Amino acid sequence: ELRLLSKTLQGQSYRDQLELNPDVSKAINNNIMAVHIPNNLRRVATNYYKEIQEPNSLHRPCRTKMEVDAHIASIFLQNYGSIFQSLKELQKRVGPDNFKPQRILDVGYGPATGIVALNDILGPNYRPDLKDAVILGNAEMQERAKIILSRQLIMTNLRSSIPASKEYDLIILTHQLLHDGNQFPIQVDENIEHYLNILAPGGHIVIIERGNPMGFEIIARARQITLRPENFPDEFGKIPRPWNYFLKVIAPCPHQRKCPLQVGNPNFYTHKEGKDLKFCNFQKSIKRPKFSIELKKGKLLATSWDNGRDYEILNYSYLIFERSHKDENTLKEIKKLRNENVNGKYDIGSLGDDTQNSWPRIINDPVKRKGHVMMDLCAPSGELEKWTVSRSFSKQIYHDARKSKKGDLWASAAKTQIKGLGDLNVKKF
RNA sequence: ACUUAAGCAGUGGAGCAUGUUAUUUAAUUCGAUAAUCCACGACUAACCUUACCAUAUUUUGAAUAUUAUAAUAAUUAUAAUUAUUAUAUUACAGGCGUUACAUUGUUGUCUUUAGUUCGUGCUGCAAAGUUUUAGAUUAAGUUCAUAAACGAACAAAACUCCAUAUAUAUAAUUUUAAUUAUAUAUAAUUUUAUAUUAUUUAUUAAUAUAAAGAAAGGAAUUAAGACAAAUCAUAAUGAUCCUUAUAAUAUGGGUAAUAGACGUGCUAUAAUAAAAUGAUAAUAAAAUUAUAUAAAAUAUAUUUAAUUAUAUUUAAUUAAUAAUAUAAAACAUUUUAAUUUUUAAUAUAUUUUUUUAUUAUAAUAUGAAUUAUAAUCUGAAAUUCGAUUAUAUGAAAAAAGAAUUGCUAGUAAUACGUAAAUUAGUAUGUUACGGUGAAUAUUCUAACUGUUUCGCACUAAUCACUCAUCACGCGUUGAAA
Numbered sequence: 001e002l003r004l005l006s007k008t009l010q011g012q013s014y015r016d017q018l019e020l021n022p023d024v025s026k027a028i029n030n031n032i033m034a035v036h037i038p039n040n041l042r043r044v045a046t047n048y049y050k051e052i053q054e055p056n057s058l059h060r061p062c063r064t065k066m067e068v069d070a071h072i073a074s075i076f077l078q079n080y081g082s083i084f085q086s087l088k089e090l091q092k093r094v095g096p097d098n099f100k101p102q103r104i105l106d107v108g109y110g111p112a113t114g115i116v117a118l119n120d121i122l123g124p125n126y127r128p129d130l131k132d133a134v135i136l137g138n139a140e141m142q143e144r145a146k147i148i149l150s151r152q153l154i155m156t157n158l159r160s161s162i163p164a165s166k167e168y169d170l171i172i173l174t175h176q177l178l179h180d181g182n183q184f185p186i187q188v189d190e191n192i193e194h195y196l197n198i199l200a201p202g203g204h205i206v207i208i209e210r211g212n213p214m215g216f217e218i219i220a221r222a223r224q225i226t227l228r229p230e231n232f233p234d235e236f237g238k239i240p241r242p243w244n245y246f247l248k249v250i251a252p253c254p255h256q257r258k259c260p261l262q263v264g265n266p267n268f269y270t271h272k273e274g275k276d277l278k279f280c281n282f283q284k285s286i287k288r289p290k291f292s293i294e295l296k297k298g299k300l301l302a303t304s305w306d307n308g309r310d311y312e313i314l315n316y317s318y319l320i321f322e323r324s325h326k327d328e329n330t331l332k333e334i335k336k337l338r339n340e341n342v343n344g345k346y347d348i349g350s351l352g353d354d355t356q357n358s359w360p361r362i363i364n365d366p367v368k369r370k371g372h373v374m375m376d377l378c379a380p381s382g383e384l385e386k387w388t389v390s391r392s393f394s395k396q397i398y399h400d401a402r403k404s405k406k407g408d409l410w411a412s413a414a415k416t417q418i419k420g421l422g423d424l425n426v427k428k429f
Numbered sequence: 430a431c432u433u434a435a436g437c438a439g440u441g442g443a444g445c446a447u448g449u450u451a452u453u454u455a456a457u458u459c460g461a462u463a464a465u466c467c468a469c470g471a472c473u474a475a476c477c478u479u480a481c482c483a484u485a486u487u488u489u490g491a492a493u494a495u496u497a498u499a500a501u502a503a504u505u506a507u508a509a510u511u512a513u514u515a516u517a518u519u520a521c522a523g524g525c526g527u528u529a530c531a532u533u534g535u536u537g538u539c540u541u542u543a544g545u546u547c548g549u550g551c552u553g554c555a556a557a558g559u560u561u562u563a564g565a566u567u568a569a570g571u572u573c574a575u576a577a578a579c580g581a582a583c584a585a586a587a588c589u590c591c592a593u594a595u596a597u598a599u600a601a602u603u604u605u606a607a608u609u610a611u612a613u614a615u616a617a618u619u620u621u622a623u624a625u626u627a628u629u630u631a632u633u634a635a636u637a638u639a640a641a642g643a644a645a646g647g648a649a650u651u652a653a654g655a656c657a658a659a660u661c662a663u664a665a666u667g668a669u670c671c672u673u674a675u676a677a678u679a680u681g682g683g684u685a686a687u688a689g690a691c692g693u694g695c696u697a698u699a700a701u702a703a704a705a706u707g708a709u710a711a712u713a714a715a716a717u718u719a720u721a722u723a724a725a726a727u728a729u730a731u732u733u734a735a736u737u738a739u740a741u742u743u744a745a746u747u748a749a750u751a752a753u754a755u756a757a758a759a760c761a762u763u764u765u766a767a768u769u770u771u772u773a774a775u776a777u778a779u780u781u782u783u784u785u786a787u788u789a790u791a792a793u794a795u796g797a798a799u800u801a802u803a804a805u806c807u808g809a810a811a812u813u814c815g816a817u818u819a820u821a822u823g824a825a826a827a828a829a830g831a832a833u834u835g836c837u838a839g840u841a842a843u844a845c846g847u848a849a850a851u852u853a854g855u856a857u858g859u860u861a862c863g864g865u866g867a868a869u870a871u872u873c874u875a876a877c878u879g880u881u882u883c884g885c886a887c888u889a890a891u892c893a894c895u896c897a898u899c900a901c902g903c904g905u906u907g908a909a910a
């Protein structure tokens with residue numbers, strides 16, 4: 001008789017396992033890999049994996065046509081999955097009705113990977129005005145991107161550079177905010193300034209990258225640069241911030257204060273004292289297509305470099321920012337909401353606005369034992385909390401808790417609400 | 430130089446068993462997630478185990494101590510004291526709560542372990558160095574050589590213990606396997622004599638030949654780094670959290686649900702291979718039996734008996750004594766679809782279990798999953814959810830391939846079996862034990878390690894330092910209508 005709350009379902013993130021469009025996977029396997037003997041493709045894929053294995057390493061533009069083949073065979077799946085989950089995250093937390101973008105930009109090394117994901121998410125009936133997609137690594141990536149996009153129903157405009165005469169209300173960035181290990185502080189600033197100028201009012205910008213500690217640091221720095229939390233102390237809740245310009249965070253951060261998990265230098269994770277550090281990443285599962293299963297085979301990709309699965313667990317970190325509309329109404333609303341609204345010090349245990357924009361963030365796998373579930377949350381109070389929900393406290397609320405996973409916004413109250421210790425090894429750096 | 434390349438032996442498309450994953454579930458107890466690949470402990474999950482779900486149900490509970498009332502004793506003298514035993518008594522006990530809660534202990538994985546300190550001696554003004562040598566030899570630290578170096582301690586080696594061959598002792602050869610058993614002891618790292626080729630040229634290695642030999646294998650045994658851990662079920666202590674609940678008991682359920690996905694094994698796909706039979710009993714080893722084992726016999730399947738499975742009944746043995754238990758492959762005969770390569774009627778023969786002549790004459794008699802009936806074993810209980818027997822069933826499985834396992838050896842393989850642990854009951858799993866017993870040679874590739882050469886503005890040591898840029902101030906000097 002006991003069932004999940006509608007509030008919990010609203011807070012729940014998308015759960016079902018991912019999968020490529022059958023037409024897209026069939027086309028990829030039939031064309032992009034059939035004409036090439038598998039061994040050389042596996043060799044180049046092994047090279048790319050080995051050169052990204054280094055700690056705090058980066059993705060790299062496809063120099064050569066063989067590298068283009070390898071990237072579509074190996075790395076396109078996880079980019080597509082990350083885009084799928086982040087885009088559905090945006091779609092749910094802005095509401096299905098309000099998410100109807102018409103001017104679209106995708107920026108990424110691979111094919112128009114956000115464009116195919118957008119087509120899949122908004123169905124085959126969505127036909128917006130502009131579907132620009134700039135491709136960087138190689139010119140031949142455009143050809144195979146056209147091969148992918150032909151099977152999905154072209155109007156999409158495959159370019160090699162950003163048009164510099166138009167704004168955009170949907171923008172997707174895939175591994176775009178940092179290209180060199182050096183200049184990590186504000187080269188992200190440079191990139192985000194370049195992409196932020198072409199984002200229309202009411203538009204969406206969706207950033208996604210690797211989800212390793214270097215990744216999480218890039219996300220944290222980008223958020224800090226955009227928001228300037230230090231410029232707005234004691235301002236709890238989500239209000240758009242100046243940066244006639246205003247922007248707000250949607251996900252995965254349920255506040256706009258300093259990130260509790262941020263330590264400035266990624267190299268701290270490599271030391272013998274930063275091995276206990278924790279970074280904000282998110283996990284998803286995606287079914288392995290045939291060409292993937294046919295690829296990871298042999299001593300190159302199937303052995304231990306010193307049972308399998310039909311799916312891959314991809315890690316990723318991401319951000320989403322919404323633009324405020326340009327109008328005297330919106331401007332005055334922002335100014336007054338900052339002026340006379342004393343939202344108060346959101347105390348440990350506070351849910352903030354008790355809506356989607358401010359519900360806590362599950363950032364770790366909850367520990368579910370008989371009669372109690374423990375959750376590690378990033379709360380709208382700007383802090384890192386540990387919330388324990390017991391059956392004695394409430395049966396319905398415990399029932400909701402035991403079905404909660406990492407990456408859900410858990411929307412209700414708990415019995416115990418203490419300061420979580422995940423940031424213990426942060427101040428000492 | 431791991432690992433690769435080669436050679437050999439395989440396994441490898443199906444069914445089932447057993448795991449993990451996904452999904453579902455009231456629960457399907459617990460395990461991984463920084464992009465090759467990896468959530469994967471089972472010496473037995475029906476109940477218990479059990480940790481999960483549902484419903485009831487217990488509240489100082491498992492212990493230590495305190496302070497009190499009741500009985501029991503012992504003493505003194507009913508009372509005093511001691512103890513014991515209950516009932517309360519509150520600190521609390523308890524916790525398969527937490528590693529995003531840490532540190533030791535350890536548990537493993539990888540690298541280096543002829544090398545690290547110490548003491549002297551010597552060289553340099555000194556920081557330092559300890560030199561030839563960055564040597565030779567071997568399959569490898571297994572062995573030498575040299576030189577301002579030489580020592581001791583650990584480590585390694587030797588040594589030790591197995592196995593093997595012998596000697597002594599022991600056994601009144603009925604506990605008999607004296608072909609054995611277990612104590613002590615010896616032996617080998619084999620020793621030699623020549624020939625040839627190399628050699629630092631003999632007082633040396635490669636071989637080969639001859640001689641004495643039973644002599645041919647094996648394990649263990651140390652530290653230093655570095656990574657990984659919470660079924661870290663390889664623990665302790667501490668931190669924090671629950672204290673009508675995250676502690677505790679009972680009933681039932683679940684851990685066995687299936688669209689799927691991948692590992693591990695068992696059974697198969699027929700003739701260099703399966704089936705039946707083979708009583709004066711072809712031939713073992715290592716084990717186990719007081720919380721047992723179960724012999725022979727009788728009876729029913731069932732049928733003259735045999736075999737196989739239960740039932741009745743306990744003979745010996747608690748053991749070098751009796752039982753588990755007549756080891757099986759091996760070997761002999763017979764049969765075996767595809768196969769008109771066969772069987773049958775007539776004749777026929779110096780092939781007679783046989784030959785000739787004329788007519789007739791894609792899944793089988795492989796496979797045993799699945800399904801049905803009726804019985805049986807354990808246990809109190811076999812529905813979810815065990816094993817066994819008989820009578821019906823009779824699926825997929827044929828061709829070629831990705832892929833991968835192991836590699837001189839009593840090893841692989843074996844339609845060869847035997848035994849033990851866990852068990853009241855269930856092994857296609859694990860660990861032991863013996864029987865038969867092969868093949869093949871290694872161009873190649875190599876991370877990585879060890880020495881080295883050169884450079885060095887770095888020294889908390891390239892995630893280094895220096896240089897230049899951008900803003901903010903404070904100064905200084907030089908020209909000046």
Ligand code: SF4
Pocket residue numbers: 219220252253254258259260261262280361363378
């Ligand atoms: S959710 Fe919290 S921990 Fe994660 S990036 Fe945002 S602020 Fe940081």
Ligand SMILES: [Mg+2]
Pocket residue numbers: none
């Ligand atoms: Mg029970």
Ligand SMILES: [Mg+2]
Pocket residue numbers: none
């Ligand atoms: Mg049970």
Ligand SMILES: [Mg+2]
Pocket residue numbers: none
């Ligand atoms: Mg305690």
Ligand SMILES: [Mg+2]
Pocket residue numbers: 524
């Ligand atoms: Mg418990």
Ligand SMILES: [Mg+2]
Pocket residue numbers: none
């Ligand atoms: Mg048969």
